[PDB]
């Protein structure tokens, strides 16, 4: 049915992106 959105997949992708972007930023600020 067109009345259903896979909010779980998008939510998980958003959490994954947040984690990756944050650790990458930490890498840039804590660079060595």
């Amino acid at each position: 049915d067109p009345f259903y959105y896979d909010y779980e997949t998008v939510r998980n992708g958003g959490l994954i992106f947040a984690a990756l972007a944050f650790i990458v930023g930490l890498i840039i600020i804590l660079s060595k």
Binding site: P2, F3, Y4, Y5
Partner: protein, 291 residues
Amino acid sequence: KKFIWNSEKKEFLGRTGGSWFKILLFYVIFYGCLAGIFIGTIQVMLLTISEFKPTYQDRVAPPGLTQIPQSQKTEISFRPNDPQSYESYVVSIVRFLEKYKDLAQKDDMIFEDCGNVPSELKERGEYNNERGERKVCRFRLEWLGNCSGLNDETYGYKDGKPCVIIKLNRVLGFKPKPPKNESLETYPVMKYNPYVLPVHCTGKRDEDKEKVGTMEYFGLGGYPGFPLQYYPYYGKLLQPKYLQPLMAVQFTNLTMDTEIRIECKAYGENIGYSEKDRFQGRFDVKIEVKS
């Protein structure tokens, strides 16, 4: 400190004359370009979506159970003795039911005669201009038992027996599915037509249920619900004069001078509920016939 009025350099409000012309001209051109860019982007976005199908509909599923007359705080209180304290509900009911008058469904190019008993979903086709305008299943105003605006214009408020016509939220391409009698072990006793979306009204607590009295369901074919022969909806672009199924509930023998909260619930697989949305699939109305 506020004498920025004038200066020897021909200053008004802070700047010279030619400077005002230059800045005003720049802002006019700049804001004009900004407005043009915004309208152009909005045009491309308008081109993205279609004319008879919204790109997203999960925010309208499941549909909601709306009640007429619509009431602020969902309370229907009036004095049956006074014909003025209940005129608001009468006005709203008449205004909404005027779209269902016997004379409104005259033309056949738009209104199509549909079965007197609930039938299967009448699929008109697809959502395009290929099949042009669509047919509308007629809904006889007499299908509402004692609140039709045909014999008693008041709808029952005159002698303390109100009527609250229940309606289903229109959803494009929605096909209601009544619960199979196999799973029929949770909802109360109701008529079972596999082509009728059931609706049952009850109280809310041990006091409201007792003080309610007698419920009287009115609908197409005498079934307490909505007939499936009126769905799916094809939007306002393909079905301009589409009439949705209606249903009425009369609260005969209600405790006078007492506010009773009743909840009507529409059951079905496609009908859900929510603890935050008091109108998703159900609704609440607190009535008080204080004569």
